[PDB]
Symmetry: C3
Subunit: 335 residues, 3 copies
């Protein structure tokens, strides 16, 4: 009975970071309390000034990652401020019943509600908005994120030996469907409501206009590139609430990967490219062995390089000539 | 030698049901005898009166599920009545040789034939029509179903412990390619033959017009919704003979899933969303813990909600507040 | 330290064959030396005279398969002759650092370079060209192949028992994006450079014009069909550097399959259809039990039968009536 347990309150942080948390823990079950506030807003999604009439949990695409341990209870307060135009809700794939919670969290502008569910299954799980009659529209306009339910004794390899990460990043991949006018330029809308009909027509073609990580082309590059060091193990959580994607780390590997994202299954090792099913989140570990700027991307290279699904990881430390060496630099073909 | 064994005759039932059968069995191998009759017919596939010039095994999309045990022999009589216009055949992925049987079962209108093969591999396997030169056309017009070959001692979990289901349902997902005229409305054809050329042109775009479960938008909803009870374990067999799909149960999980559909491999647990490769059938178990109406759908939500790939499961029993509770119903944001 | 070890030199062969090599080996680590030469050339890709302005390693699509053992070092000399127009490089997914080697192998026409890396992970891995700013273009015009890193003691099943193949074939699948003119016919270009802009526009639609095995429609059919005998085990290596595919052997199975292509993971058994993620190579074993001509194909049957992704395997030996028998040949439905 959950009414007996202690409560904790967690303060969420914005992607790509994930809020501090323990992996293996001595602590017993708790009710973990979270709050998120919906923000509808217009966002610029590319380097030519294209806009999206977006919908977000807590102002970001994706929404923040919530982290609990298996056996915990998640207690979410969801707030839809009066500054918004649309009703919203939440479906947690990690939850059991009532369409993931959607049936109990229908909130019109100016309202709020509070849901509890048992996080009884370990893994990374998508959450998303699911208003009746307009589910795909809210999802593809940005209303999704990840719940990570860690096993109480931390992650394990196929032989039951312990695994860990020194640092975690969360990547949400968003297939966008931005309409164009008769002139061939993307339309800019005044309100969310006025984008709907043209957007549905684009959706039905199944061809995204843009595919972005974390809300925009180049979100995870330059000053916003991800960071690590030789010797550090990173966990890359990758969510795609609507469409398949195939994550790859260029110059690296997936050392241990749960592509279906469920920690009670053995992970696979040495992956070049893994597969996130639309409607799921997965997770990969990698320990950096070389310094440099890596790219992390969807390995449909058109989706990555033309449509936007790629970021950078900047890695510090010493080059290792045993792993890789330039034996002869580019030079003329001998006469 | 198969000529020594006893024979049985099975009476098929229409999807979503599956014919009665045992899981683990004391009985030894048999020759299991089936018969199916091809019906070409025009079908209405959506709520605005769109028609498909369809082709079916036994009058349904999908065709009926055939269930045997590993080591059995499947003996199929395939009948193509003179009321049909086209030649047809059958390729069983569960079989070995002669292109799955297609080379031995070429039947013109007014003909019939009988094939035997050993069901020597456990799993769910697609069967489909495969006439030389027009294979994709017969498949996407509806000529596919599932053979389920159960291990002789029933299903097992990764540690070799027994698994079972209390009730089985079969779902065939069909990507349809219905042409449109110059006015933008879908074409209605007088005969099967006259649909061919326009349909090929749509196929080559790789963009379905509709994606449906069991032959039509909403086939598995309302009076035709699937049913279960809290405490009951259901097996969901999902076939897709031509295109990938990503099954999800909203408010539930895949407790044990063979996404590649082959029972001698360990299943994965706790899945939110699984993946059926085009050209395969997979199978998932789930034990219901909450009552309510669930949706089972392809989690490309555009394919589900716009194009038709979704059904309902109505579940009876008692709500469980430990799994999920509404702590505060939707109410105004406190002043 | 790699500078201590003996060197070997391997002579590559053209696909679908793979250069002679041992599976399990008594021999210790070596530096294995390879060389490949880039050839840009116009190729005819279908039976109506459509051309592609192609780019290749060693004149073939795919490039040749390189085979080493885990612990070896791969030493590649990459040559870009002055007869070519574009700069090129190589990214080995099997390697660690410097974007797979791409940063160290930038070679303009008339230049060459030599790279070394440790093949420290077992599996089949894609390699491809990756020039900065035009990565998808070089890949989809044909610049990819497979590195196979065999475990030092050969392949193993899930229980650690030995597996082997008697013969290996390499299949590269290429999604092509050939532009059309206002008349609806495919464009024929005079140079590689002049194809670029129109090709990018087609790429962005995500809809290939053709999908071919080994550079053309029907490459692996007729005189070029693959061959085997009843009793022989074949390994089918399948690479797709940009787009997903779903290999199937019609009339056969995947007996043992590493669909993610990494040999330190247990393989799955009895597959009808497996899944190669874009950006990866996978590998399947099958032991032939029936003679005949088999088709090996991408089981999106539109992609196979309309767009070109299918080949043939011609198999010699004796029919087995226990596996499959025609009980009654096609005959009139009894009066
Ligand atoms: Cu919403
Ligand atoms: Cu969902
Ligand atoms: Cu047919
Ligand atoms: Cu098939
Ligand atoms: Cu190149
Ligand atoms: Cu790559
Ligand atoms: Zn309490
Ligand atoms: Zn560490
Ligand atoms: Zn890129
Ligand atoms: Zn970049
Ligand atoms: Zn008999
Ligand atoms: Zn039961
Ligand atoms: Zn829906
Ligand atoms: Zn519904
Ligand atoms: Zn040396
Ligand atoms: Zn052998
Ligand atoms: Zn074909
Ligand atoms: Zn053929």
């Amino acid at each position: 009975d959950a009414d007996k347990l202690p409560h904790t309150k967690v303060t969420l942080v914005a992607p790509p970071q994930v809020h501090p948390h323990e992996q293996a823990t001595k602590s017993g079950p708790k009710v973990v309390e979270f709050t998120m506030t919906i923000e509808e807003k217009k966002m610029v999604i590319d380097d030519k000034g294209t806009t999206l009439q977006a919908m977000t949990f807590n102002g970001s695409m994706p929404g923040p990652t919530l982290v609990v341990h298996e056996g915990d209870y998640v207690q979410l307060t969801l707030v839809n401020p009066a500054t918004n135009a649309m009703p919203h809700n939440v479906d947690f794939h990690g939850a059991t019943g009532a369409l993931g919670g959607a049936k109990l969290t229908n909130v019109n502008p100016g309202e709020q509600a509070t849901l509890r569910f048992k996080a009884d299954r370990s893994g990374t799980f998508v959450y998303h908005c699911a208003p009746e009659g307009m589910v795909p529209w809210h999802v593809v306009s940005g209303m999704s994120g990840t719940l990570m339910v860690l096993p109480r004794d931390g992650l394990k390899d196929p032989q039951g030996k312990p695994l860990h990460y020194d640092r975690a990043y969360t990547i949400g991949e968003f297939d966008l469907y931005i309409p164009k006018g008769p002139d061939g330029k993307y339309k800019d809308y005044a309100t969310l409501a006025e984008s709907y009909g043209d957007t549905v027509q684009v959706m039905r073609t199944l061809t995204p206009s843009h595919i972005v990580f974390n809300g925009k082309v180049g979100a995870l590059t330059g000053a916003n590139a991800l960071t690590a060091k030789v010797g550090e193990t990173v966990l890359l959580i990758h969510s795609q609430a609507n469409r398949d994607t195939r994550p790859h780390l260029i110059g690296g590997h997936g050392d241990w990967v749960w592509e279906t994202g469920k920690f009670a299954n053995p992970p696979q090792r040495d992956l070049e490219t893994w597969f996130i099913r639309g409607g799921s989140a997965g997770a990969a570990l990698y320990t950096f062995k070389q310094p440099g700027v890596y790219a992390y991307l969807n390995h449909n290279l058109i989706e990555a390089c033309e449509l936007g699904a790629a970021g950078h990881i900047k890695v510090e430390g010493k080059w290792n000539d045993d792993l890789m060496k330039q034996i002869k630099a580019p030079a003329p073909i001998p006469r």
